[PDB]
């Protein structure tokens, strides 16, 4: 007996090919990515940014390399500065800044290993990024993704610009989410592994240090699918996007079973993105590829764009 609720749902914007990756840079404007944008049956995913007042899109970057088109599935935003670090799974990571301009920032790990396409990212309020990476290697190798096969990776991209895989072997490794101390410290890494219906978790013992690898939760379910995007709220409940359960889990911080779940007015929920400093939480969804918009009982997590590098506490 998990008690469930339905909050209002408000419909922000739609007609966006796999609605992904949302996200609020420096400024608050609100952006979010359509991996599934297709031309020629070859991939040409964008990167869009949304007026929030009338819904309004606008594609401000058509990530493209040599040739190959980007499939650009979520995003983070800087602290230091209002740029954009994206997980493409056909080109790795992005760094895309506001204006349109994008790098692609490595084609090769720490050991030298072709990069893998990536899906998710998170960091930590050291300046760390999270990375899944569910896709094969980058282009121009051929398009492939371990969703049958474990062959999905999880990278670190450290402070000082090193690409550390930190471990292998998941079958499509999907969201992520970095759980903290109240001083402040990484102290949690979360992996939400989609098909196999597990949350898997990992002590943060420093930068691409991880250890202790634990079943954290288990994802509600028989349907094809299961946890892709999440997000802390200010309490350390962690909620978790249900794809294809119709449904978003809020795990309490020990994980295990769902504490509780919230009903969406769709099937699909992707990914899911706090408006700073507010209990707004905006969600993508697959089933109508729109966003829309509830409110929580509380606040979100700050993310570590919204933290001070110059500040006194
Ligand atoms: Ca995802
Ligand atoms: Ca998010």
């Not at 349109?100 to 084609?107: L, N, R, V, Y």
């Not at 079973?257 to 919230?262: D, E, G, S, V």
């Not at 993508?284 to 001070?308: M, S």
Request: aromatic content about 10%; glycine content about 10%; charged content about 25%.
């Amino acid at each position: 007996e998990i008690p469930v609720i339905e909050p209002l749902f408000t419909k922000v914007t739609e007609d966006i090919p796999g609605a992904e990756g949302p996200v609020f840079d420096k400024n608050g404007d609100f952006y979010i990515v359509a991996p599934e944008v297709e031309v020629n049956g070859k991939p040409a995913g964008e990167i869009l940014r949304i007026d929030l007042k009338t819904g309004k899109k606008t594609v401000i970057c058509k990530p493209e390399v040599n040739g190959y088109g980007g499939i650009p599935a979520g995003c983070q935003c800087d602290r230091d500065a209002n740029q954009l670090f994206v997980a493409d799974m056909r080109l790795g990571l992005l760094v895309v800044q506001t204006d349109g301009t994008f790098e692609e920032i490595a084609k090769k790990d720490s050991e030298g290993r072709r990069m893998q396409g990536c899906n998710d990212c998170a960091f930590d309020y050291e300046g760390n990024l999270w990375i899944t990476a569910p896709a094969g290697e980058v282009a121009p190798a051929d398009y492939t993704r371990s969703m049958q096969e474990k062959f999905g990776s999880i990278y670190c991209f450290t402070t000082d610009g090193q690409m550390i895989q930190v471990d292998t072997a998941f079958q499509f490794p999907n969201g992520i989410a970095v759980r903290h101390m109240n001083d402040g410290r990484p102290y949690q890494l979360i992996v939400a592994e989609t098909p196999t219906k597990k949350l898997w978790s990992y002590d943060i013992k420093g930068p691409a240090k991880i250890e202790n690898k634990k079943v954290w939760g288990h994802i509600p379910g028989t349907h094809e699918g299961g946890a892709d995007g999440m997000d802390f709220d200010e309490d350390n409940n962690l909620l978790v996007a249900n794809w294809g359960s119709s449904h978003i889990e809020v795990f309490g911080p020990d994980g295990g079973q769902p504490k509780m779940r919230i009903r969406c007015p769709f099937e699909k929920p992707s990914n899911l993105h706090f408006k700073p400093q507010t209990k707004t939480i905006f969600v993508t969804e697959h089933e109508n590829n729109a966003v829309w918009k509830f409110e929580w009982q509380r606040n979100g997590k700050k993310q570590y764009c919204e933290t001070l590098k110059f500040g006194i506490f």
